[PDB]
Design a protein around this ligand. Structure first.
Ligand SMILES: *[C@@H]1O[C@H](CO)[C@@H](O[C@@H]2O[C@H](CO)[C@@H](O)[C@H](O)[C@H]2NC(C)=O)[C@H](O)[C@H]1NC(C)=O
Ligand SMILES: *[C@@H]1O[C@H](CO)[C@@H](O)[C@H](O)[C@H]1NC(C)=O
Ligand SMILES: *[C@@H]1O[C@H](CO)[C@@H](O)[C@H](O)[C@H]1NC(C)=O
Ligand SMILES: *[C@@H]1O[C@H](CO)[C@@H](O)[C@H](O)[C@H]1NC(C)=O
Lengths: 49, 49, 97, 142
């Protein structure tokens, strides 16, 4: 998702299904690489719980 | 006249399981609301009468 | 006079065995107290403008500072639900007295 | 099961005692809810059985006293409680009231009003001094 060579264009934005897996959101959210990481019904600290 | 709780003890085994679905008095008590018994029993009111 | 008293006491038993609603003054008091308690339990389902009615979900999903603003909304409305219940019960206690 | 715990199912945190349920959940249901919109049953995400959730036992505590210039002796009513829940409270873990010298027992009385500790049950009746409920009163006497 985040490092794939080619993104979709915003008029035809791609959707991937995320399923049957252990996510780690500390591995994402603690990265220095993101200018925006903005949440709308959960704090990004709580995503691992 | 049919009463809704007289106050005369709830001992968990009479309120868990099937009763935790089919009784309002367990939804009241599990939310911090309790009936207290009257000081005179109905048998003492009948002795006065 | 004795046979008329004995027959009139017979009609009390027959009526109390036959009609349903005669103790409606006592049943209305039991119904009002039950309906007021059911109303108070049901006010826990209200969000009062918070993200959830469920206090544990606010604490599962939000950090200390975000959760305080949501919990304050539930405290405000639940405290108002108790102040309403206790005022209505103080007003009913005067009718019963 | 049958023990008071801090549960967390799929991120649903709560405090309660878990029992095996006979509730008939459909495959698309993970939780059941009360009329207060609180979760009151859950399907365990490891082994798909249904667990009833019930809150850890609780009740009012009333303290029964003569005047403090008459005595420092008090009795305690755990109100709406069967006696068994006050020994089972044994303070090797926590409670809301920190004190537990009463739960020594030896002078426990079951009333309809609750579990009464620190008062001797006597068979001979008197006029009501301190009202406990359900026909029971307490008094400070020789
Ligand atoms: C307090 O709880 C105990 C159980 O822990 C109750 O004892 C049961 O009483 C019934 C009716 O006599 C019997 O069928 C059971 O066999 C008893 N069980 C045991 C383990 O003794 C007791 O009745 C309760 N008392 C009150 C007043 O609630
Ligand atoms: C958890 O383990 C049990 C036993 O192996 C299994 O039946 C169940 O399907 C597992 N849960 C998931 C999500 O597969
Ligand atoms: C309370 O008891 C003390 C003695 O311990 C006595 O001096 C006082 O007058 C008493 N007061 C009342 C109101 O009983
Ligand atoms: C009360 O009296 C009965 C006999 O009528 C006796 O069996 C019982 O043990 C007595 N209880 C107390 C607390 O003395």
């Amino acid at each position: 998702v985040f490092n794939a060579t080619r993104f979709a264009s915003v008029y035809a934005w791609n959707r991937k299904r995320i399923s049957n897996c252990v996510a780690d959101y500390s591995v994402l959210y603690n990265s220095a690489s993101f200018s925006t990481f903005k949440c709308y019904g959960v704090s990004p600290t709580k995503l691992n719980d | 006249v049919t009463l809704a709780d007289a106050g005369f003890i709830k001992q968990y085994g009479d309120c868990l399981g099937d009763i935790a679905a089919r009784d309002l008095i367990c939804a009241q008590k599990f939310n911090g609301l309790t009936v207290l018994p009257p000081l005179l029993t109905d048998e003492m009111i009948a002795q006065y009468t | 006079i004795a046979n008329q008293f004995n027959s009139a006491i017979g009609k009390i038993q027959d009526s109390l065995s036959s009609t349903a609603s005669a103790l409606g003054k006592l049943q209305d008091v039991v119904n009002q107290n039950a309906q007021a308690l059911n109303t108070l339990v049901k006010q826990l389902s209200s969000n009062f403008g918070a993200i959830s009615s469920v206090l544990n979900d606010i604490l599962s999903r939000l950090d200390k500072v975000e959760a305080e603003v949501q919990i304050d909304r539930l405290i405000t409305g639940r405290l108002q639900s108790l102040q309403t219940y206790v005022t209505q019960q103080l007003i009913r206690a005067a009718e019963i007295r | 099961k049958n023990k008071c715990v801090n549960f967390n199912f799929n991120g649903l945190t709560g405090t309660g005692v878990l029992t095996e349920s006979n509730k008939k959940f459909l495959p698309f249901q993970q939780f059941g809810r009360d009329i207060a919109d609180t979760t009151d049953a859950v399907r365990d995400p490891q082994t798909l059985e249904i667990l009833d959730i019930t809150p850890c036992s609780f009740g009012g505590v009333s303290v029964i006293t003569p005047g403090t210039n008459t005595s420092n002796q008090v009795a305690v009513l755990y109100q709406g409680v069967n006696c068994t829940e006050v020994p089972v409270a044994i303070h090797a873990d926590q409670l809301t009231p920190t004190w537990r010298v009463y739960s020594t027992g030896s002078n426990v009385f079951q009333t309809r009003a609750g579990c009464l500790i620190g008062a001797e049950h006597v068979n001979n009746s008197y006029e009501c001094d301190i009202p406990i409920g359900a026909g029971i009163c307490a008094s400070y006497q020789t």
